[PDB]
Amino acid sequence: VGRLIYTAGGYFRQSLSYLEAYNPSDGTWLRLADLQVPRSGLAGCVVGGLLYAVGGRNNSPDGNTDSSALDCYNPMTNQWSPCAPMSVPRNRIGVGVIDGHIYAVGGSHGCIHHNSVERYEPERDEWHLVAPMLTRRIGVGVAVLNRLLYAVGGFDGTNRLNSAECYYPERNEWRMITAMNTIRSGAGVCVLHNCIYAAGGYDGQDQLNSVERYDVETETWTFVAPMKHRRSALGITVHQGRIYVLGGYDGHTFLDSVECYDPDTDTWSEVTRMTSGRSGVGVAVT
Numbered sequence: 001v002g003r004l005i006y007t008a009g010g011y012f013r014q015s016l017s018y019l020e021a022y023n024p025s026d027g028t029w030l031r032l033a034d035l036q037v038p039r040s041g042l043a044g045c046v047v048g049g050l051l052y053a054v055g056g057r058n059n060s061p062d063g064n065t066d067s068s069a070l071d072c073y074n075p076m077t078n079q080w081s082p083c084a085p086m087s088v089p090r091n092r093i094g095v096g097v098i099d100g101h102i103y104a105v106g107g108s109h110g111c112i113h114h115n116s117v118e119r120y121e122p123e124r125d126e127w128h129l130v131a132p133m134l135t136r137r138i139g140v141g142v143a144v145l146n147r148l149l150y151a152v153g154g155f156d157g158t159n160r161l162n163s164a165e166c167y168y169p170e171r172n173e174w175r176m177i178t179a180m181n182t183i184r185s186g187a188g189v190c191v192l193h194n195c196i197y198a199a200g201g202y203d204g205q206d207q208l209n210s211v212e213r214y215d216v217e218t219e220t221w222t223f224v225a226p227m228k229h230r231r232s233a234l235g236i237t238v239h240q241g242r243i244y245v246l247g248g249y250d251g252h253t254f255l256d257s258v259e260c261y262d263p264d265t266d267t268w269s270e271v272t273r274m275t276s277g278r279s280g281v282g283v284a285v286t
């Protein structure tokens with residue numbers, strides 16, 4: 001009877017179709033309607049209390065194909081419903097919500113490394129392209145803060161990135177903001193109390209466990225306590241003023257651990273474990 005952390009899809013051995021939700025007050029997991037097609041490297045977001053699944057890579061009998069798909073899940077009806085697909089496929093995608101619109105940002109088609117972002121209008125059920133990013137980004141993290149969209153880290157097709165750019169919908173243009181002190185692709189990026197948090201990811205050498213935040217007051221990146229477990233391609237969300245990071249890859253095993261970050265005490269604790277270790281999930285809280 002509360003807001004829940006949903007995790008859709010993921011990977012373990014092959015692409016996953018699970019939808020599950022976690023209740024933080026009683027620490028319990030719920031099993032909900034599976035995705036109609038299994039996907040990993042998708043992103044999740046919530047608009048108008050609906051759960052949208054964006055992008056990822058399909059796994060199917062035809063083959064493993066990068067997805068263009070947008071699908072919408074209603075917690076009241078426990079039902080998945082297809083919507084209009086994006087202009088292009090996008091694996092390793094990031095998404096953010098501004099003014100009840102979904103921004104699909106970056107991602108990979110084959111090895112087209114996208115730098116185009118498109119915006120979906122739920123009422124109209126339409127996707128319309130907007131200004132493309134300055135940089136090509138896949139495995140990119142996205143965050144919205146004061147109606148400004150941030151794309152953080154990723155891989156441009158040749159380099160792993162520590163830059164981050166910020167989108168002013170007002171002007172429909174992108175500007176580069178201060179780079180992170182760490183190169184992160186596949187990171188977890190969320191907003192919490194006027195900070196963007198980039199957590200884990202891959203710097204090109206090893207999977208990361210460090211966490212840094214961009215304080216927009218200072219437009220500079222600080223380090224904070226690190227996670228207990230290295231993890232790349234994690235899912236991240238914020239719930240009741242704490243950060244949650246779910247699963248991911250450590251270079252060795254597919255994590256099932258869920259860690260919770262208290263900004264007040266600047267510490268991480270492991271609050272639970274998922275039912276199955278996985279990575280590349282989409283996460284949203286409604």
Ligand SMILES: COc1ccc(S(=O)(=O)N(CC(N)=O)c2ccc(N(CC(N)=O)S(=O)(=O)c3ccc(N)cc3)c3ccccc23)cc1
Nearest residue numbers: 011040041057092138139155185186202232233249279280
């Ligand atoms: C073989 O073992 C597996 C390890 C992970 C998975 S996955 O389910 O999580 N998955 C599914 C997909 N490709 O769609 C993904 C894989 C790699 C990514 N990165 C590349 C990027 N950002 O471009 S990475 O930086 O995080 C990274 C780099 C190197 C290593 N060794 C590990 C991770 C992803 C980034 C965002 C979302 C998903 C990603 C499946 C098998």
